Write a protein that binds this ligand. Sequence first.
Ligand SMILES: CCNc1cc2oc3c/c(=[NH+]/CC)c(C)cc-3c(-c3ccccc3C(=O)OCC)c2cc1C
Ligand SMILES: Nc1ncnc2c1ncn2[C@@H]1O[C@H](COP(=O)(O)OP(=O)(O)OP(=O)(O)O)[C@@H](O)[C@H]1O
Ligand SMILES: Nc1ncnc2c1ncn2[C@@H]1O[C@H](COP(=O)(O)OP(=O)(O)O)[C@@H](O)[C@H]1O
Length: 1353
Amino acid sequence: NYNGFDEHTEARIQKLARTLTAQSMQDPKLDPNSENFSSAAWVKNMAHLSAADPDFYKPYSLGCAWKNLSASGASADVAYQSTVVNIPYKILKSGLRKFQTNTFQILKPMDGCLNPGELLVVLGRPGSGCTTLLKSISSNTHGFDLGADTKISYSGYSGDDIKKHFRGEVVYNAEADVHLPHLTVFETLVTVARLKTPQNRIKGVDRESYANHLAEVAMATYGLSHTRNTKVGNDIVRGVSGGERKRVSIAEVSICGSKFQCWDNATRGLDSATALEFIRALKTQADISNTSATVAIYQCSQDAYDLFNKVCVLDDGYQIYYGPADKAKKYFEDMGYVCPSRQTTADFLTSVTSPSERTLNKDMLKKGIHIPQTPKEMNDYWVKSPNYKELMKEVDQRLLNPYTVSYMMQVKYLLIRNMWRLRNNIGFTLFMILGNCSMALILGSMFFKIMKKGDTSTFYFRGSAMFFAILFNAFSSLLEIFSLYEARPITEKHRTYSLYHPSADAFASVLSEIPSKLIIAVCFNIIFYFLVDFRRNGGVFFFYLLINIVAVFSMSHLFRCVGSLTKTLSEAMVPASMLLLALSMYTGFAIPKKKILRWSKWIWYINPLAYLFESLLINEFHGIKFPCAEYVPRGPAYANISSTESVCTVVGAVPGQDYVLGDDFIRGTYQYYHKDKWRGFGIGMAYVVFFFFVYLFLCEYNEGAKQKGEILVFPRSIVKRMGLSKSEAIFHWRNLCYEVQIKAETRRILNNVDGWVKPGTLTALMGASGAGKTTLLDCLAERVTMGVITGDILVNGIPRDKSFPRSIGYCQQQDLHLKTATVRESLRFSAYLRQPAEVSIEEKNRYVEEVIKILEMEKYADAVVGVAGEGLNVEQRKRLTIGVELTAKPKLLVFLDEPTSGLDSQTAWSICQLMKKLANHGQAILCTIHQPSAILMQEFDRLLFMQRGGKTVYFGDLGEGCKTMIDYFESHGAHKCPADANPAEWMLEVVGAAPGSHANQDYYEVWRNSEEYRAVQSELDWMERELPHEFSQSIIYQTKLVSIRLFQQYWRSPDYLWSKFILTIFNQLFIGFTFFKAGTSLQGLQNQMLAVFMFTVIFNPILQQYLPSFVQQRDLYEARERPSRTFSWISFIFAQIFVEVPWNILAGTIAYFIYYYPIGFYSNASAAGQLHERGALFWLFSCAFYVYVGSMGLLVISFNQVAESAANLASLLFTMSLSFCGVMTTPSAMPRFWIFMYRVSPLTYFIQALLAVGVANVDVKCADYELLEFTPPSGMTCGQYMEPYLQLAKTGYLTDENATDTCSFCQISTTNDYLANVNSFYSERWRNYGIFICYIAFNYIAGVFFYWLARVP
Ligand SMILES: CCNc1cc2oc3c/c(=[NH+]/CC)c(C)cc-3c(-c3ccccc3C(=O)OCC)c2cc1C
Ligand SMILES: Nc1ncnc2c1ncn2[C@@H]1O[C@H](COP(=O)(O)OP(=O)(O)OP(=O)(O)O)[C@@H](O)[C@H]1O
Ligand SMILES: Nc1ncnc2c1ncn2[C@@H]1O[C@H](COP(=O)(O)OP(=O)(O)O)[C@@H](O)[C@H]1O
């Protein structure tokens, strides 16, 4: 707990000062080693000496003073919802509107002043202009225009002046907790301290020592010393508590020396005590650093409100009161309103703007005095009031009258921060190193055998192995983008106040990866170059390693540039995928430099991997003579021969040689010359430097964040034009208990709890944070699974049956709804599945209308749920959550879990009024409540109060003004409740659960021996004696509804489907037109094989695009639809399959149409008289491949919790299948060990059948450079000479059978014989299609089974 400079922090800071001065040694008000030393004086001295630099003309304090302040923004006229068939027109129309308006007055003219050292609380309802005010007075007016008449003076500096120079002296913080999760608090603060040390003006203490001291003083000042070595953490990574996480942000901004601050949503997610601690830390900062801060907060506690000097009250953008906080209540009570005795002043000030909550002073109405009731009237009254006159006197007088450390020091400190990040998340990096090591091991094992012999038979495999090496080194840096994106928001924060250049952060990020990149390169290349058995000369190996280093750095920088240009990784997925495809395909192995068409030769020329692969091949092949493997004239008939009458069967061969000079081979096949060896290094370094500079430039300037108004979406079909059943049984539980084995052997969470809820009564379930409130709801609702429950939970005196979980309604704290659905659609979806089967759908529609009317959401019934930022706000989402359960016609109860938590006071009161209205209708509502205000407590009929450990302390009708509860407690020793104390908080103090932990006695035992307890027992006995199909719809109907909703999600998810289809179109079109009519040359055939190979590499991105949709569906299901018994997991998974398949089939059809024909497989099929059959079968394979990618995505996500891990697993399996599919290395060339992997991978059968269909049953046309030349023996034509050989190796054709001086030979006559070498056959095509479909079926079935295992309980 934090108490804002109690003597403990003073002693801690005195110890720190003694340590600093003693370390240096190795006026009496300030000498730590003496008496009279004052810790406040010490911190104040440091804060002054931080801003006392002779070169700095910054102020010692800033205080804003504005008048006429008015802001406005372009009206956000509600716009229709984006859908796959509508987003193109939407983009076109938006582009036209930008190519070629009304306004909304966000804030009407306001005035105010805030001297240094003061704290201002801005009070207003949501949408009242609080955030806009904080952005205006902090000069963050991006997204809206500021009035032409506004005047803002920061103690003399115009807002323009602080924007130009002193930015960071005025700081606006939307959320406090934006931190690197994996740094400890001390590291997070020491990096900031280092970046702020005035590097020229410290003597006697080393700069690291001073930075450490300043970080420790910041921690002690804000009560964080106990978290020195704790990880800062996150909502998903364990670390310091939320309050400590926000006080870390306060300490950080304190170190950075901002003199003016704003905190828009400071206390979001904090309970009363923790929010008070945060405000107290802010007050301590104001006292010490003399900063002025402004906080916009809801549910402001009276204790917290006591700390603010000034208050600002808004409603509809009008200012109603500005001035001292303690005068606000009296000012409004003079206005004509009255504060209920127990109402905290902040709630009074905020409610005075809410007509259904205010209370007009009846006396002042009898006098006929007008009491303003609408915001304009209140603002006019304030303008008239003497408070405004006095405020303007103060304002008018005040309107009458870049980085601390050099660039390289910023780089150094940010690099150290990055290394700390790595050494705290080191597990990921270790798995990362091991992944590359293992992939190198596997690939090298795959090439080990064939490469070993070294004959000319290994040329294609040398090419393929070097292609793998260059790819797996160049792209082994791409998973640093995760860290890049994670760091970007904190870089933006640290830019909002001048701490370092964003270029310094980018440069630190680049330099921090060098260790990992070098280690990966060394390990991978050492393992690979040895297994693959490239040249063992040391110099060539080191040149190879150098080229790989240049490749990895080049790609790292190129894709950092892309990452910098996108909001998230998902948005970069598409262009990054295009870049990967272009670079990998045009590296010079898939299609040699000779065969690249004129339309895309420039791609080779600008591709760095092309030049680097050139250098690698020149290095590998240059100057080495590979002994010839096999000759054309061959066999016993050719035992005796002259050397020149034979030739080696490879490109660079010359007749009569026993070897082929690898340089000749590469010159013939790729046209790389030894003179170009060092071109690769030069171009690679040129690219590396250029893209490094462009990365710095982009990170320096292209960033920002813009404000936009909350909007409702109202799908286009709407924009074209634009009775609740009573509870019937009494639910009572007796002697309830619950134990779980997790934290301790037989640990009780509930202890003999008992009670009941009757129809038409709203029951409050209260307790401290924890205390088994939600646990009691989960047990009563039979929503809990683990542990053992004991005791009675009876309905109408009878044990709850198997229909009970359906008969009740349970509104969870988290309002989770399918974002793409609409409010009306969501309610109708809930009604259809859960209401009794025999109810006609028109009646379900009418009941949904009744429910919509009751919740008074009719004005936005058609809106899209969306998300927090766009769509329904918190109140609307809560109302939708309640409606969804009301539409299930819960026969028995309605369980609510903290409906009023996370809301403001006025929205909370609105929700409580809705709950009481429902109870009046007849509903039996049991709802957990947290820190309710005394006014809300007047709504609940009964109160079940539970002490820590699930130990009931009270259960009774709290009656009027909580008098019954107060009386029960006071009669039993509790100290009298003050007439102005909140009964909820007071009772929480009586039992000792609230801080100040001590109780006059164990009140659990007082209850157990109370008279109320025996009365409850008698009533429970009478309830015991008053006693006189797991799913509603069948599985087929549930599947129908769920699949329809999932379709409506794909539709209306234009980003996903358009990314999928544009990626398909671009990738496959690029493949098809890179190999445009490749022809049937010997190289053309393997080029087409590699084209079919590249057709498959689209797998990863289109799987990763799909996974988020499944995760979005699955979260909603498992979190609300499953416990509610809305539908069975069977329907969920069948919908996931049935909806994903059709879109994959459509994408496959598009891919076929744009790939099969451009590349020319159609002409090959036509030449064979098989156009229709082969075209149809290729279309079937494309559709099957896309369906298979979908099925693999489903399989991997069926048990992986997060999408990233599922994507990684799918990528690894696809990599194995692709590597061992038998084209990068033929099956007979693999080690006998890997034949299982070759046989099992689906891509063997896919690729073999696809290539067979593409190029089977036609003739080969060997180009000039491919023909084999040799001289026929004396006195016989080549026609006669080659006949003996030609009859045994029964294929091949001489270009001239009657030549006698020399003849050219083609060793493949027809493409079928070539395909036989690749092991692909035409007669197998249909069997392969069947096998591939079997793979899809197994993927889907295994996915279903693994979802059943992993996820179903
Ligand atoms: C848009 C970028 N696309 C991708 C880039 C990737 O780069 C990777 C770089 C790596 N090096 C460290 C940074 C490591 C270890 C794995 C990587 C994977 C990967 C992860 C798991 C299994 C296989 C692979 C994989 O295929 O890796 C091929 C290099 C990976 C995956 C995708 C989709
Ligand atoms: N360009 C714009 N920028 C900001 N708000 C706008 C704009 N156009 C219209 N508005 C509307 O003006 C109102 C201003 O309220 P604002 O959000 O600033 O205060 P608030 O809602 O109390 O702040 P917070 O959202 O942090 O609680 C909002 O309802 C918003 O929808
Ligand atoms: N592993 C666990 N899983 C679920 N609940 C647990 C576990 N360990 C302890 N608990 C119990 O969960 C309770 C916290 O939930 P609860 O108090 O119902 O939430 P809330 O107070 O927000 O309604 C604690 O009382 C604690 O005894």
